[PDB]
Design a protein around this motif. Structure first.
Motif, PDB file in Angstrom:
ATOM      1  N   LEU A 183      57.991  72.429  88.877  1.00 52.54           N
ATOM      2  CA  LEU A 183      58.206  73.340  89.466  1.00 52.54           C
ATOM      3  C   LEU A 183      59.290  73.376  90.611  1.00 52.54           C
ATOM      4  O   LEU A 183      59.598  72.366  90.974  1.00 52.54           O
ATOM      5  N   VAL A 222      50.872  71.087  85.513  1.00 48.56           N
ATOM      6  CA  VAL A 222      52.185  71.640  85.020  1.00 48.56           C
ATOM      7  C   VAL A 222      52.820  70.634  84.337  1.00 48.56           C
ATOM      8  O   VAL A 222      53.060  69.625  84.733  1.00 48.56           O
ATOM      9  N   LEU A 259      50.805  83.306  90.345  1.00 54.80           N
ATOM     10  CA  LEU A 259      50.616  82.438  89.012  1.00 54.80           C
ATOM     11  C   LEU A 259      50.861  83.299  87.838  1.00 54.80           C
ATOM     12  O   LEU A 259      51.618  83.042  86.976  1.00 54.80           O
ATOM     13  N   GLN A 305      50.337  79.383  82.537  1.00 51.77           N
ATOM     14  CA  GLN A 305      51.011  80.466  83.143  1.00 51.77           C
ATOM     15  C   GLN A 305      52.505  80.051  83.264  1.00 51.77           C
ATOM     16  O   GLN A 305      53.397  80.654  83.396  1.00 51.77           O
ATOM     17  N   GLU A 306      52.563  78.677  84.092  1.00 58.73           N
ATOM     18  CA  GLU A 306      53.841  78.100  84.409  1.00 58.73           C
ATOM     19  C   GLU A 306      54.583  77.354  83.340  1.00 58.73           C
ATOM     20  O   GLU A 306      55.880  77.581  83.388  1.00 58.73           O
ATOM     21  N   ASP A 307      53.849  76.927  82.210  1.00 57.03           N
ATOM     22  CA  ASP A 307      54.589  76.129  81.274  1.00 57.03           C
ATOM     23  C   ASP A 307      54.877  77.168  80.184  1.00 57.03           C
ATOM     24  O   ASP A 307      55.876  77.176  79.478  1.00 57.03           O
ATOM     25  N   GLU A 346      59.156  78.017  93.831  1.00 57.41           N
ATOM     26  CA  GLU A 346      57.848  77.936  93.264  1.00 57.41           C
ATOM     27  C   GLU A 346      56.858  77.314  94.296  1.00 57.41           C
ATOM     28  O   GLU A 346      55.855  77.987  94.772  1.00 57.41           O
ATOM     29  N   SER A 379      61.272  82.128  89.404  1.00 59.48           N
ATOM     30  CA  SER A 379      60.447  81.702  90.671  1.00 59.48           C
ATOM     31  C   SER A 379      60.345  82.934  91.514  1.00 59.48           C
ATOM     32  O   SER A 379      59.580  83.096  92.508  1.00 59.48           O
ATOM     33  N   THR A 387      45.975  78.722  93.337  1.00 54.14           N
ATOM     34  CA  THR A 387      47.070  79.353  93.188  1.00 54.14           C
ATOM     35  C   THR A 387      46.715  80.792  93.853  1.00 54.14           C
ATOM     36  O   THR A 387      46.018  80.903  94.898  1.00 54.14           O
ATOM     37  N   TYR A 410      53.591  78.606  96.522  1.00 51.48           N
ATOM     38  CA  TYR A 410      52.514  77.969  96.602  1.00 51.48           C
ATOM     39  C   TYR A 410      51.924  77.285  97.700  1.00 51.48           C
ATOM     40  O   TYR A 410      50.604  77.566  97.941  1.00 51.48           O
TER      41      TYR A 410
END
Ligand SMILES: [Cl-]
Ligand SMILES: [Cl-]
Length: 298
Positions: free
Chosen positions: A181, A177, A41, A275-277, A185, A2, A37, A189
């Motif tokens: 998060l 996602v 990101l 991109q988060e996963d 994070e 994060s 985002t 955001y």
């Protein structure tokens, strides 16, 4: 993870400030985010292209991240003017684009209109044919269809997004996602959007999606981008996930059979904000693809 271990720089574009990450040196890899985002990101992907010997450039779209909040409409037309201006301000040339969501529309348009300046394009969860434009709300399914109709309805969308911050607080963490998060994070955001008025770009973006011909400008741009995508000879890279959102398996299969010079990398479980996963698969992927292709613009 994060963590955001990058200082941001600022540059004036069309009278307003654009904030951006600027790391490494040499050939630029320009990262373009979408809704809702920011350059945040890309935080876990950027280090891969820097270590590969590239210059990672990741701006926050106008009205988003740490960029200025001018009194504008935040339509596609507006956003492309600030990103083109940003490219000019930095004198970026021989660019590799890494693009997502509305960033994919802005990115592909730039490559389309400036084919001499774009070496290669990596994209994911893009607003592009065959999936876009959308013929109707019904065509989006029983969840996304009515949701986008709501967002695009007067008063309803304003209440959901401006008063409730629905895109940031729900669509992003819950729908877009697979993993949860973290609090750090989410803080990052939501930071650009603490007020009703500040949230306008997150409301205007779903109103830009071309559905049933509306709005005409974004429809035209998405269609022309689709024509560019099918005709362009430049190296391309697609990341996708299961079940995905804008790009489910059958959409990817079609693209893989029809887009020239396309490398496809499945990342596993994900919906929209891939991109988060899977930031490391995506990061390693871009770097490997660049190592083999060494793309340069003609
Ligand atoms: Cl959107
Ligand atoms: Cl990963």
């Amino acid at each position: 993870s994060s963590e955001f271990p990058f200082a941001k720089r600022t540059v004036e574009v069309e009278g307003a400030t654009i904030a951006y990450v600027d790391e490494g040196s040499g050939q630029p890899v320009l990262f373009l985010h979408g809704n809702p985002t920011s350059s945040y990101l890309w935080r876990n992907i950027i280090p891969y292209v820097v270590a590969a010997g590239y210059r990672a450039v990741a701006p926050d779209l106008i009205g988003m991240g740490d960029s200025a909040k001018p009194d504008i409409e935040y339509r596609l037309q507006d956003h492309v003017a600030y990103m083109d201006g940003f490219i000019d301000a930095l004198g970026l040339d021989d660019m590799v684009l890494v693009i997502h969501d509305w960033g994919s529309v802005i990115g592909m348009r730039h490559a389309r209109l400036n084919p001499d300046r774009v070496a290669a394009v990596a994209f994911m969860e893009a607003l592009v044919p065959p999936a876009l434009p959308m013929p109707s709300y019904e065509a989006m399914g029983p969840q996304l269809g009515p949701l986008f109709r709501d967002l695009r309805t007067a008063d309803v969308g304003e209440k959901m997004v401006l008063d409730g911050n629905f895109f940031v607080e729900t669509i992003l963490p819950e729908m877009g996602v697979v993993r949860s998060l973290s609090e750090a994070e989410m803080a990052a955001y939501r930071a650009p959007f603490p007020t009703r008025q500040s949230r306008l770009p997150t409301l205007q973006w779903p109103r830009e999606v071309p559905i049933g011909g509306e709005p005409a400008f974004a429809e035209a741009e998405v269609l022309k981008n689709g024509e560019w995508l099918m005709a362009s000879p430049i190296p391309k890279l697609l990341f996708h996930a299961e079940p995905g959102a804008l790009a489910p398996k059958p959409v990817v299969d079609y693209l893989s059979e029809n887009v020239p010079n396309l490398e496809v990398r499945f990342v596993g479980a994900g919906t929209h904000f891939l991109q988060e996963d899977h930031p490391h698969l995506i990061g390693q992927g871009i770097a490997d693809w660049l190592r083999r292709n060494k793309p340069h613009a003609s």
